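ok so heres the complex, ten chains, lmk if somethin looks off
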Amino acid sequence: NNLVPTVIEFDIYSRLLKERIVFLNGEVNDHSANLVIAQLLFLESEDPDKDIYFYINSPGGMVTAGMGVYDTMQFIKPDVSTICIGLAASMGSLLLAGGAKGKRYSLPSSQIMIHQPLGGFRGQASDIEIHAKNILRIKDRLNKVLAHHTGQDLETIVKDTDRDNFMMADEAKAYGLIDHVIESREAIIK
Amino acid sequence: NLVPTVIAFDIYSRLLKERIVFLNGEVNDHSANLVIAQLLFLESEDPDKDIYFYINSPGGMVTAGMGVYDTMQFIKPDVSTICIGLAASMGSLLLAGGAKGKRYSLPSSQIMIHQPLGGFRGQASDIEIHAKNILRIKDRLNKVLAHHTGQDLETIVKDTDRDNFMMADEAKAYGLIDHVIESREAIIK
Amino acid sequence: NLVPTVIEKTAGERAFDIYSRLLKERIVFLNGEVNDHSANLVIAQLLFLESEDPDKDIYFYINSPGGMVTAGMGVYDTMQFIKPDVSTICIGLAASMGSLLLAGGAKGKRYSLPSSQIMIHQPLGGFRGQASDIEIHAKNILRIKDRLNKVLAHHTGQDLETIVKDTDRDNFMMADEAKAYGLIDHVIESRE
Amino acid sequence: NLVPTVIEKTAGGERAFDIYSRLLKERIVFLNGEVNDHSANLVIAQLLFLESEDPDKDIYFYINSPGGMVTAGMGVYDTMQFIKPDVSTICIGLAASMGSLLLAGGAKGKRYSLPSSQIMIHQPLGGFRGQASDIEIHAKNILRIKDRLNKVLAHHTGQDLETIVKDTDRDNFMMADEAKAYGLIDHVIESREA
Amino acid sequence: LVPTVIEKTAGGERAFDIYSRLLKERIVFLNGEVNDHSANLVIAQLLFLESEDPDKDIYFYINSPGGMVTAGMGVYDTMQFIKPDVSTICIGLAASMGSLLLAGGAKGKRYSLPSSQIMIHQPLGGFRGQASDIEIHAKNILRIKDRLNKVLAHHTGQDLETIVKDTDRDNFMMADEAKAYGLIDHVIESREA
Amino acid sequence: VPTVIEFDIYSRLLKERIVFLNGEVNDHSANLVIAQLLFLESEDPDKDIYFYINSPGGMVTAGMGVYDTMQFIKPDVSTICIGLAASMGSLLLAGGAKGKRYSLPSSQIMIHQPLGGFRGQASDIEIHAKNILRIKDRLNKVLAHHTGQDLETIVKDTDRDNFMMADEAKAYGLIDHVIESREA
Amino acid sequence: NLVPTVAFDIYSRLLKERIVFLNGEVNDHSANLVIAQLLFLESEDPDKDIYFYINSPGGMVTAGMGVYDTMQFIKPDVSTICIGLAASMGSLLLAGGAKGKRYSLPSSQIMIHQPLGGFRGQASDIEIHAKNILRIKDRLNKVLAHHTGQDLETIVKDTDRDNFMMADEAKAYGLIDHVIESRE
Amino acid sequence: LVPTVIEKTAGGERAFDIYSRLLKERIVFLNGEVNDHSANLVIAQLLFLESEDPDKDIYFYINSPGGMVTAGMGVYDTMQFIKPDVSTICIGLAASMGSLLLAGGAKGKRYSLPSSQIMIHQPLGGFRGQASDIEIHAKNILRIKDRLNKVLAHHTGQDLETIVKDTDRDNFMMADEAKAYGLIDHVIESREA
Amino acid sequence: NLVPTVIEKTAGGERAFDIYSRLLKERIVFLNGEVNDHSANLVIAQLLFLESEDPDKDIYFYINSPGGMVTAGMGVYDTMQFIKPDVSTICIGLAASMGSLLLAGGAKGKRYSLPSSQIMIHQPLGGFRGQASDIEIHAKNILRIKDRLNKVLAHHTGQDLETIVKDTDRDNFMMADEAKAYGLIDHVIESREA
Amino acid sequence: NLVPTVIEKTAGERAFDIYSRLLKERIVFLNGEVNDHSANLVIAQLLFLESEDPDKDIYFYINSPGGMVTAGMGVYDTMQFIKPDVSTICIGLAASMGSLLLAGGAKGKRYSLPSSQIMIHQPLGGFRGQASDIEIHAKNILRIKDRLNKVLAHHTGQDLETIVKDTDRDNFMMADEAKAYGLIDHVIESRE
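and the predicted structre for the whole thing:
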């Protein structure tokens, strides 16, 4: 049943954080993004050379909040290895893709989905225009980010994200969003 | 709630016999279409007599309203317009769009002009499509007001960037109307 | 209970509701809130009655708390524009735009029944947005405020400043007090 | 193409001749339910209509009302005093607050109640929220109204003012005989034949 | 939707709603709740019928759970006031004020169809506020209760004591029971009996 | 939740390598199971983990994360159904350690095809249909692998809701054993 | 997903290393909490820098100006770091950090605009409130000009409508002093 | 979530919420609306601090739009009652009852930071019921209005007449203006000035 | 593992020591806001607790309340009279209805108000809907309560009964000095030092 | 305001809320509505206090309008089942199931404070469905009605018929009246 259980001398998430495991789970918003960031900054101050394991199951959500996690992943000293444990959709896929070169995983049955930004505004034509312009920049920037981490040319990322584009894990490996798909801990690496 | 009855006509139908049509309240598909139909009827009854289109509207839907504007231009009759309260947004465009020399207001009317309002949510590609579209609509509304007012296009853009309220006398000075009328007996005309 | 009907025998039959029937006697009512619908329906009756007879008085019975200033000011202007004198008669309340309409009736022909309540006030408004737009709408309502005070000054004979002072807060008046102020001409208790 | 008869109009504009229209021919007018701007204005229109039809024939104003808006109701009271015809009032269920005012406002000696009616008098009710300045403005105003309505009831009942004040401080329910004794009505009536 | 019937007034021709057509035979319905709207409509019909002819019987068909006491007592008092005898007929339910109206019809002319439900009870009310005002309203509802019991006693022929006891809680009666009790005079099953 | 300060009841039972999925499968309930499994792994990578299930299913992606973690980690994850295992709940029960998929006698087990829903342009409708069909295919294939049954059988047998009692779920290969008492 | 322990909760641990977050809306609650933290850090050591991490779409001006003032009042330099969004009062607080110590991550969105407000009532009172918000609009513009080095008339022009800047644009404009891609 | 701070009571060790930690330095906050909950919490802190030491200054930080007059007047009266001087500091907004609280701090020890908004007004209220009861409540709010004006006059040094005029409608002041008016004694920008 | 200090507990069971807990050490108890079963029972528990800690030391019961449920509140009143310790009462904002009853219920000579407090007395409020029988039952009951609360206020204020009845018929607001003159409190107090 | 805490100094520190602290003095409260949650929590305290000491009295303070009869009757039975005497003390209201609980305290050890209100009544219920099921639930509540009347008869000493007559409608009693009826044993005003 549903609440965080506890351990001897800590909730479970606190116990796993001790092994440098961080979870993004569910929607990306100011609350969820800030918490991952507090956690990355904290692990970095505990040991700036040890790898961090960022486990992702998210449908995405707010771009400004998520791009904070993304930026923080790149900025801090440790490598941030990503692993998709369910869904990595939208901002969630971007964060997966954004993990350290060579160190992005997915479990076999996970789902990866990539798309263009959703937004929305209501008001004067002048302000609508302001807001549309801005979303078009962010669209370009996020495609540039995916082109960098994937290996794809920009125009390929653009065409492939015009609509929701869903991928299985192997397809996600093949496309460059992740590096390995892993199935058993004892198995050999690839 | 209750429209008075006269002779067997409802009061609006009886005034329609004197070629008077009202826009009252919001512009929407219902209220626009009722004006359009009355205008087509009045033309049908006599394509040469003037039609008197009394406006008291805060505006509303642009597509609905431009149908009325076009219908006023399309029909043979001259459509005199008369502000009896408020002519804002699509309201002021319809008022300004009446026949050369035959756009009136009563003294106490408020007239307000502005740029279009809109709203879209979805993908960035579609936001771009809708934004381009409302910008075209903004520019054309502006040209429509420059035409009827005799103001420069830059001047209209600038004076519609934010809500711009005018009293009757100011709306005349600006070219939105031709005359402020206080009394039926008094001149000119 | 809803408005009844009168049958008129013709050369068959004709039906009118009571208000339609009174309109034939040149009686027009404003009852309840002033909005686009109510104001416009008064305006139509007024234009109708002018068309039927440009020279005979109209009797415009008022029981209203006021409402929307632009709608009300159409009625006020229509009242001055048309040829007939519009005599005004307060039959319960005339507050806010209701008291402006009462006051704008024809000279000498502004009436209240004895127990009516008459109230005058400055306008009410509301806007939310950018400080730029707030300023625009604040300027506007202040210009409206001034115009309505000028209307009342004109019909009452009071100095504009007196109007300003006396409408700064709600100012309730009895009929005799409204007469003394110049908001109406006569308090009437009985038809003879 | 004669006008259809119905028991009751669904809408004000309906081109049909209803029971109320039928009885308005007999100079009968109803106030039924709450006094509000709608109900009060309908009474007024019908009273002015009846007066135009015949200024020297009685009008029968049948009242079943819990009261409501004092300004709306005082337009009815006023109109009843202003028109030439006598306005007889009859309570047929409830005459409370502005309802009882209207009933006691009838023509001298022509104020009636059916035997089982409830008549209640009281002081006015109001409500205001805002600044203290404005609260004082509204309180002063309701006090003048209270006093004016008390003077009206004193006038028509023959009670002196200080009795009306005392007896309206709280809701005061009266049976028909009591209302007659108090001077709110003139006659309690049980059948047409007596 | 209410059906229409067209009659040749000669004239030539007038439409009636089905209800106005039946009004021509001096039939009047109370159907549903007693409230200011329903009560007044009935009282208007009664006054109208009396103006049409003050001596002919009126047939007042009742199917009502009751409702407001002041509204319904207007109806009761108008029944007694007008010249015509008001026959009452229960055609489904006559409960609370409904049953008071049924029982107040003209002596010897109170009917029910055989399957109707007649129920009598004490009044319901309620009030909130100061203790002083609670008292005023309580005293008033006790006066109402007593007057209604006295009316039922008068029309049933029961003692006031018996009415009081039998109305303390909801008391449901079949038509034949109501007749025995004095709330109606006949149960009728068929027009030609 | 019964409560000593310095364990709750679940914490104590976690100390016996007992984990629960109780109620709907969603991002919250799936993730907490994943966290517990990974913790249990770090504490002893050979001792069995007892995964009690009582669930109508829920979000596929969340649950298929739990499925995958169950396969990935060292120790055997034994599954025990303790009331209901429907939809994603039966998938998780059927995914337990071979030889170690259990049910109490009275449980209900249900398998079906995936539910979803979508609103939008035809193009997007097509995209989403195309994807749920792949997911359908993939879950049938998982059921097929874990029960021994032919893909074909699974496809016919999950077309509409298929309810099984414990004995039927064993016979079908969604569980390995029905257990009634401790002493067996 | 709730706040992990490390005994502290993770924010409290970061507070001990002189790190403060404003995350989400500025209102009385969130602003006061920042004020309390700043006062506490100053008390602990009045000479050490404080690191104020911001991700906010702004909110209540008066609550926000309390934070601004406190940042200027206390002895420590308050370095500001935008870590997702800094809009309206957000950008004001970012821009109000210590000279030379205002940062953003590379992908942050920074947005400046005039104040939002509103009022309903008597004309006299609409006027009072309108004049009030015009003072607040002028004060904020003066504050932005002071910290950015722009002329007041430039600030006024550029905040008439929402003005979204990328982190490099924000730096050239003077709302921050550095964009930091990496180090610690 | 409220951050925690751990201090070595020696002891050995106790956790404080950030607010209880600042309470150790005799700092107390009113943040948001004045209501029974917020007022009472403040009054508890004040009484607590006075028990800890009756001579040391207390630092009462205010960021409030006001709210209930009875609740806030408890706070005011407790400020004046207790032995310690209650320094007041405006840290965003002090409106309505907020500004009364700010102005009632110890003489010479009322502060604002430079960007705060101080607003003074007359009381708000409302009531519905009988005319008699409307009168009672009106008289009572006029007494309240007068007493609050007299308090502001006392602490500002303004005439009662001036207070009355300047509170008739919302009156917004910048910090430096409030100081000039007598509602605070100093505007402070920096700790070391 | 010492107990954390907070300003205020988020929940009843929170293992933290708050400002109210701190002051309860000093024998201070608050009634803040509405009198209901929750708030009244908390006062009672704290009074019984304080009495168990020391039956011969004063308790300081600080009151800011608009009143509320009379039965809940009369349990507080009773408990205050039943326990051995003197219960001093202090008004710190509002003492209205059951709130003023509790304040005037304090120990002889130990009833206080801060200077700006509002004290209001009135008659009880109730409400019932149902059969006339049951309405009469509830009305009779509220009348007995009205009379009992009037006798309590007579006792503690020294006013005779007929004065309490007269002065509570409608809401009666009193400033602190007035409440002291009326005998609802003993002392108005402006600062600790006087 | 929420329940405060007491710190107990140990050999470090321990925290109790006030109710936990009073439970140590064998005081249990029923406050507000009787439902599954409230009744059960009383039952647990009662079983707890028996386990701590099977021989020392418990003090069960009652301020309740009643509520759910099945939940309440668990508390009543638990009261009789356990070894300790459960003394009952009415501290505001004891109505309906609240008055049953008060009345079921141990012989001689049923108390009210002087201003308490005690009310007794027949049960309330409600069902909608088929006439068959209506009948089943009507039979049931009548059997419940009878059982509760028998409980009150037993603890009061009144004849069952008197209980029946006196609960047919709500019957409000003052403390002295409740004592005279046998619903409690003593009205207490002061501890000595």
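quick notes: Chain D has one domain: 1-194. thats all i got rn
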